[PDB]
Amino acid sequence: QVLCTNPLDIGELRSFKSKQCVDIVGNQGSGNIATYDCDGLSDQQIIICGDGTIRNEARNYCFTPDGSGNANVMSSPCTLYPEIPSSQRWRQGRRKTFTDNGGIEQVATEIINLASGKCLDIEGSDGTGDIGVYDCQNLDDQYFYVRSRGPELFYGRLRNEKSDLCLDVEGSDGKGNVLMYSCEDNLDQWFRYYENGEIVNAKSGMCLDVEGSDGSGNVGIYRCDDLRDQMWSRPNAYCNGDYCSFLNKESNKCLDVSGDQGTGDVGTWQCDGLPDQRFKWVFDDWEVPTATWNMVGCDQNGKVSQQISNTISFSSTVTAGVAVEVSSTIEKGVIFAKATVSVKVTASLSKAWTNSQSGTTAITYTCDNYDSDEEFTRGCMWQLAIETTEVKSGDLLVWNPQIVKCTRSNTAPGCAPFTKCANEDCTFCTDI
Ligand SMILES: [Ca+2]
Ligand SMILES: [Ca+2]
Ligand SMILES: [Ca+2]
Ligand SMILES: [Ca+2]
Ligand SMILES: [Ca+2]
Ligand SMILES: [Cl-]
Ligand SMILES: [Mg+2]
Ligand SMILES: [Mg+2]
């Protein structure tokens, strides 16, 4: 598997103990792995692969123990032949569920190496430091979760009820002070708002933040830091139709524009019920996307192999702006087999879409195993299709990522992308 074609999850991998991110040194996706602050870079977007590997979005490299026994873990080239070695494959062990400080239900597990049976481990017991593998000893620092933000609640530009101006970040890179500006087709005016309270800027991937930690003062976009002053509520009681206030969870103050004309600098201030403290989400309507599987090929008496490409079909240019809009739409909800999918499936699909704007990156893929894990002796290869329609134009968008399932059946997989076929024919699912 040159690329991870059967991912189960994409996101930050967090220590249960410290809540720090599992980090590759620098930003290139290769090198030593240790804990660090979560910095929004693509190397900290970890890919939990169905083949047992753990990869990342910065570089197509694998979490790898440096030697046998207790050993350091680094991001290095995935070994593919004659097979991926058990040393670069991992499984989930025991689980812990918990509610994090943002109110999200998370699931942490042990991450166990298949060769040694040792646990992914952080030096010591505080959940900070160098990451390697070590005997499993049940402590919190050997539990890891892929961070869920919870559902994406809303998204788009935030337009002020008083002025009709939009939240904007100084400059164009999505970082720094937030103030009011004319609503335009700039990426840094687009935000996504989650159940965990975060309001995340599309340009920078950084969070709507109050200076310091007490929730009182100037508002800007700064590194998402998991603190309560970066959590926002949008209570029905403070709404006027689709224009609503945003109350800071730490201070209980309103997102506010200086004075009362809705034209100046943005911070938090005592709520006062005035129109300049209310904002509407402005976005174009796209239909709820649907996921299906397309047959690539079948071989009834051996392995199926075929070239697979990441393709996007759309009547117009998929600009940076279209891409952000489609990512937002996907994350809000997807239908598979007439049903909604879990938050991790939509979060991961939206991330895969964002990370699929670099071309076809064609590869040859061979079904060596059924999606359920057994050796592939016959069956079909299936490629994902995500379809949505922009409502104002009626233009259908079809995205075919390099996300595949190998099954024993001529019937399409009964499992959504980012979930695992439980049996060879793929009629039910695990890891949902
Ligand atoms: Ca890094
Ligand atoms: Ca330890
Ligand atoms: Ca700007
Ligand atoms: Ca802050
Ligand atoms: Ca004001
Ligand atoms: Cl403070
Ligand atoms: Mg390390
Ligand atoms: Mg400001």
Neighbours of ion ligand 6 (CB under 5 A): 212-214
Q: How far is the CA of 331 from the centre of ligand 8 (A)?
A: 28
Closest to 348 (Cα-Cα) out of 69, 57, 23, 123: 57
As given in the structure block, the two tokens for residue 388 are 């949505």
As given in the structure block, the two tokens for residue 303 are 């392995």
Q: From the centroid of its chain, how far is CA 425?
A: 28
Q: How far is the CA of 405 from the centre of ligand 3 (A)?
A: 42
As given in the structure block, the two tokens for residue 216 are 């009182």
Q: Which amino acid is at 239?
A: C
73, 133 Cβ separation under 8 angstroms: yes
Residue 308: what are its φ and ψ, rounded to 5°?
-130, 135
Residue 101: what are its φ and ψ, rounded to 5°?
-70, -15
190, 157 Cβ separation under 8 angstroms: yes
Q: How far is the CA of 24 from the centre of ligand 7 (A)?
A: 8
* Architecture of domain 2-150 in this structure: Trefoil (2.80)
| 13: β partners | 146
- Give me the resolution in angstroms, 1 decimal: 1.7
Q: How far is the CA of 321 from the centre of ligand 6 (A)?
A: 35
Does the domain at 151-284 match CATH 2.160.10.10? Answer given as no
Residue 275: nearest ligand to its CA? 5
Q: How far is the CA of 318 from the centre of ligand 7 (A)?
A: 39
DSSP letter, residue 240:
B
Q: How many Cα atoms sit within 13 Å of 220 on the Cβ side?
A: 13
Residue 245: nearest ligand to its CA? 5
- Which of left, alpha, beta for 83 (phi over 0: left; psi -120 to 50: alpha)? beta
Neighbours of ion ligand 4 (CB under 5 A): 209-210, 229
DSSP letter, residue 189:
G
Q: How far is the CA of 120 from the centre of ligand 7 (A)?
A: 10
As given in the structure block, the two tokens for residue 358 are 């670099």
Q: Compute and round to an integer the Cα radius of gyration of the chain.
A: 23
Does the domain at 285-432 match CATH 3.30.1750.10? Answer given as yes
Q: CA 365 → CA 8, 78, 90, 298, 360, distances in Å?
A: 18, 15, 22, 13, 14
Q: How many CB atoms neighbour CB 377 within 10 A?
A: 14
Method: X-ray
382, 412 Cβ separation under 8 angstroms: yes
For helices 343-354 and 320-332, angle between their N-to-C axes, nearest 10 degrees: 170
| 299: β partners | 379
Tell me whether domains 151-284 and 285-432 share a fold: no
Q: Sign of torsion, CA 356 362 367 369?
A: negative
Q: Domain-by-domain residue ranges, the chain?
A: 2-150, 151-284, 285-432
Quote the CA–CA distance of 54 and 10 in Å, as a whole number.
Answer: 10
CA angle, 307 as apex, 305 and 313 as ends, to 5°? 135
- Helix, strand, coil shares of the chain, percent, nearest 5, are 10, 40, 50
Pairing of strands 335-336, 290-299: parallel
Q: How many CB atoms neighbour CB 189 within 10 A?
A: 24
Q: How far is the CA of 218 from the centre of ligand 4 (A)?
A: 9
Residue 169: nearest ligand to its CA? 3
DSSP letter, residue 102:
T
Q: From the centroid of its chain, how far is CA 310?
A: 19
